[PDB]
Amino acid sequence: SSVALIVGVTGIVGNSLAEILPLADTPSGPWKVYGVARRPRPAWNEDNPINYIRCDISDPKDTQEKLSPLTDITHVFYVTWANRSTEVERCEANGKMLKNVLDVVIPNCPDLKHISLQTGRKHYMGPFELIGKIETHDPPFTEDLPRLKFDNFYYTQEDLLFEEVEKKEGLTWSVHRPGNIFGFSPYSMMNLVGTLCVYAAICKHEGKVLRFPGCKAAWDGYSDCSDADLIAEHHIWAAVDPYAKNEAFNVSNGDVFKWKHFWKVLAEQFGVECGEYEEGENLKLQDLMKGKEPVWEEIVRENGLASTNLEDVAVWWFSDAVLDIPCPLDSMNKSKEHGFLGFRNSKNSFISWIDKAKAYKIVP
Ligand SMILES: NC(=O)c1ccc[n+]([C@@H]2O[C@H](COP(=O)([O-])OP(=O)(O)OC[C@H]3O[C@@H](n4cnc5c(N)ncnc54)[C@H](OP(=O)(O)O)[C@@H]3O)[C@@H](O)[C@H]2O)c1
Ligand SMILES: CC(=O)[C@H]1CC[C@H]2[C@@H]3CCC4=CC(=O)CC[C@]4(C)[C@H]3CC[C@]12C
């Protein structure tokens, strides 16, 4: 039997992995699962049968303290990261966290088979501060083109991964580069669906229009996304498929869509009048939602929602980051050619994840 450690078990993928790994039909079942995070385990994470371990993996002491007893790890799913003001900062911060974790597990887990690291499409686009400002490789992005000549903590994290896995013979790795993730996690630092749901709710409550806070390319251009269950299935796939070992793979839903169409979906789900991209207006939810914490607190009190503060449930800057540029497509051909044929209907994905938020009473 095989034992997973999910590093970031309350994140938008960590939660998906917390729910899928213990399932019976999950490959290499039955799975023992350890799940790490910092905050006290929230209610929406309890419905999974995970061994919850509070640990701040930036602290080498706490990481040695919390993870060293875990003698029986077989697979590691790194589903976390730390944000800073400069990418160079992100590099050292995210290297240290990843290194803390690996430096403990590998010498302590004689059954450790695989280490599965999640980065993202920003590997091809450059960091936030530089997105849309640098010559990238022409999309669709394929996994084994050269890295950009700009610092990127995905690269730092990768080169680190490579070294560590050599300490244990037969230890093997995989890298997964999702696009924007449609998922569920009121704690995630990048939760597009979650943030968009709060917006619509606020709009419904105020009776205003669901205006579009994005650029024409996001409205009318092709976009794609990465369903969080699929991303979880993708982690599991490389962790167990020996012909996927030691490879980076994109993971996206297998289709495209336009926000002009999904916007109507978003509106209908919350009973709001759907707005439409207006020229030269460049709305920002970061600007448009300033000071709305009393309105949220009213929406919550009224509609019976769980006690959430929008700071947690709405990451405005990230919705802006997403909608304020055009969406470069990636390719799933390497994944498919290696056997990962999983996919998701993105429109159904969107509704599915809007509805999980409703179901957990995060939004109305
Ligand atoms: N989210 C997206 O849309 C998206 C899209 C593409 C790529 N990615 C990439 O995917 C990777 C994983 O990110 P994610 O989006 O899955 O993150 P996420 O949803 O915010 O999840 C982070 C998880 O790690 C935990 N955590 C935070 N700080 C920790 C620490 N010091 N020690 C231990 N646990 C800690 C969080 O819980 P606590 O805060 O309670 O500890 C949470 O469980 C990152 O490299 C990210 O860039 C994300
Ligand atoms: C519509 C649009 O522009 C979106 C859809 C795909 C998005 C990108 C997908 C990859 C990515 C990962 C992130 O963590 C945020 C920034 C970026 C770089 C996103 C910025 C905005 C994009 C390009």
Author numbering: 26 to 389
Task: Please share text taken word for word from the publication where this structure appeared.
In order to investigate the function of this protein, which we termed PmMOR (Plantago major multisubstrate oxido-reductase), we expressed, purified and determined its activity with different substrates including 8-oxogeranial, citral and 5β-progesterone. The structural studies and enzymatic assays presented here demonstrate that PmMOR is able to accommodate diverse substrates within its active site, to catalyse the reduction of aldehydes and carbon-carbon double bonds and to perform reductive cyclisation reactions to form the iridoid backbone. Each monomer of the protein folds into two domains, a Rossmann domain that binds NADP(H) and forms much of the active site cavity and a largely α-helical capping domain. The SDR superfamily generally contains a catalytic tetrad of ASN-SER-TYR-LYS or triad consisting of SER-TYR-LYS; however, the 5ß–PORs lack this canonical tetrad or triad and are thought to use only an active site TYR and LYS residue for catalysis.
To investigate this, we co-crystallized PmMORV150M with progesterone and NADP+. The V150M point mutation yielded the best results (similar to what we observed for citral binding). Omit maps showed density in the active site, defining the location of the bound steroid. Progesterone was modeled into this density, however, despite the relatively high resolution of the data (2.56 Å). The resulting density was of poor quality, so the exact position of the ligand should be treated with caution. A second dataset of wild-type protein in complex with progesterone also yielded an extended difference map peak in the same region, into which progesterone could be modeled and refined, however the crystals diffracted to lower resolution and the map was of poorer quality. It is likely that the size of the pocket allows for significant movement of the ligand, and the observed density is an average of multiple conformations. Nevertheless, the binding region presented here of progesterone is largely consistent with the model suggested by Thorn et al.. and Hu et al., and places the C3 ketone in the same position as the aldehyde in our 8-oxogeranial and citral bound structures. By contrast, our data and model favor a conformation where the steroid is flipped 180° when compared to the previous models.
